[PDB]
C-alpha cells in the first residue's frame, strides 16, 4: 500500500493482552497501523518488572544504526529508551521531568516539616 509521502520510523508496537502490555521495537512506515505491517523488528521492550525486578529491553543495535542511516525517524518513547541505554544522550524531557519531580518532592518535604513543626 503505497502511501502519499511518509517515511520510515522506529517506534513501539503494542502487543500482549489486557493489563499485560508488551512492546515490539519495529521500523515501519509512519502511516501504517501501530500493530500492523512493519519493515523489520529491531528489538522488544517488556515494561512489567520480571521476577528479578528488571525491565528487559532488547536492542538490535547493528540494525538500528542501519535504519537511522537510511533516513528513519525515532518516536519520542524510543528516543528515551536509547537515552536510558546510553546509546543516545538523555532526552531533554527526561532531564526536565526529573527536575520537576525534584521540585515537587522538595515542596512536599517542606509541607511535611511545617506540619510536624506545628504539631
Amino acid at each position: 500500500k503505497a502511501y502519499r509521502g511518509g517515511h520510515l520510523t522506529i517506534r513501539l508496537a503494542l502487543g500482549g493482552c489486557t493489563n499485560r502490555p508488551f512492546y515490539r521495537i519495529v521500523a515501519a512506515h509512519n502511516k501504517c497501523p501501530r500493530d500492523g505491517r512493519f519493515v523489520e523488528q529491531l528489538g522488544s521492550y517488556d515494561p512489567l518488572p520480571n521476577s528479578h525486578g528488571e525491565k528487559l529491553v532488547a536492542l538490535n543495535l547493528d540494525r538500528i544504526r542501519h535504519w537511522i542511516g537510511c533516513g528513519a525517524h525515532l518516536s519520542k518513547p524510543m528516543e528515551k529508551l536509547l537515552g536510558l541505554a546510553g546509546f543516545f544522550p538523555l532526552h531533554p524531557m527526561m532531564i526536565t521531568n526529573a527536575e520537576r519531580l525534584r521540585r515537587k518532592r522538595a515542596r512536599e518535604v517542606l509541607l511535611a516539616s511545617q506540619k510536624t513543626d506545628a504539631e
Partner: protein, 168 residues
C-alpha cells in the same frame, strides 16, 4: 503401486538428491542424445535419471532435449555472457556426466554453505511474532516474566478495573 518404471524418480526425496547447482551464468542447457547405440547409453540414463534432479535444483534454467539429430550425444550450455560450453558425453556413464558438469559449471560446497547461512539471518531468535515467523509470540512465554492474564490472573493492583476504582 506407483505407475511406471523406477517410480523412485517421482519422489521429493530423490529429486533433492541432485548435487548440481549451476552458477548464475548458466541460462540454457541443451541435451542431444540418441535413442539407440551402446556408446550413447550413459547419455540416455542421464536423461532418464538425472535431468529431473538438475531441473529441480535449477528451476529457472531452460532444459531442452533433442533426439537423434547428430551421430553422437553431447551437452551444450549457454551462459549469460554469450559463451557456449560444449560437453562430449559419448562413452561416459550418467554418473561421470553429473560429476563433469558439476566441476565446470556447478557451485562448490563452500559457496552453497555460505548461502544457507545468509538465510538463517532472516529468522532472528530474539524476535517475537506468529509461529510461522518466530519461535515465541509474546514475552509472557519466557519464564520469569509476567505470564499472560489468560492463564494466570494478574493481581488486582495491576488491573485497570481496580486502579480506576480506587482512584475514582
Amino acid at each position: 503401486p506407483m505407475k511406471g518404471r523406477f517410480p523412485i524418480r517421482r519422489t521429493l526425496q530423490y529429486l533433492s538428491q541432485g548435487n548440481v547447482v549451476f552458477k548464475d551464468s548458466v541460462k540454457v542447457m541443451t541435451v542431444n542424445y540418441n535413442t539407440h547405440g551402446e556408446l550413447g547409453e550413459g547419455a540416455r540414463k542421464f536423461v532418464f535419471f538425472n535431468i529431473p534432479q538438475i531441473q529441480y535444483k535449477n528451476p529457472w534454467v531452460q532444459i531442452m532435449m533433442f533426439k537423434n539429430m547428430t551421430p553422437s550425444p553431447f551437452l551444450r550450455f549457454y551462459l549469460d555472457s554469450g559463451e557456449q560450453v560444449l560437453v562430449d558425453v559419448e562413452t561416459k556413464s550418467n554418473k561421470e556426466i553429473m560429476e563433469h558438469i558439476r566441476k565446470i559449471l556447478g557451485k562448490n560446497e563452500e559457496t552453497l554453505r555460505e548461502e544457507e547461512e545468509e538465510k538463517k539471518q532472516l529468522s532472528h531468535p530474539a524476535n517475537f511474532g506468529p509461529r510461522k515467523y518466530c519461535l515465541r509470540e509474546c514475552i509472557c512465554e519466557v519464564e520469569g516474566q509476567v505470564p499472560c492474564p489468560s492463564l494466570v490472573p494478574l493481581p488486582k493492583e495491576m488491573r485497570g478495573k481496580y486502579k480506576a476504582a480506587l482512584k475514582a
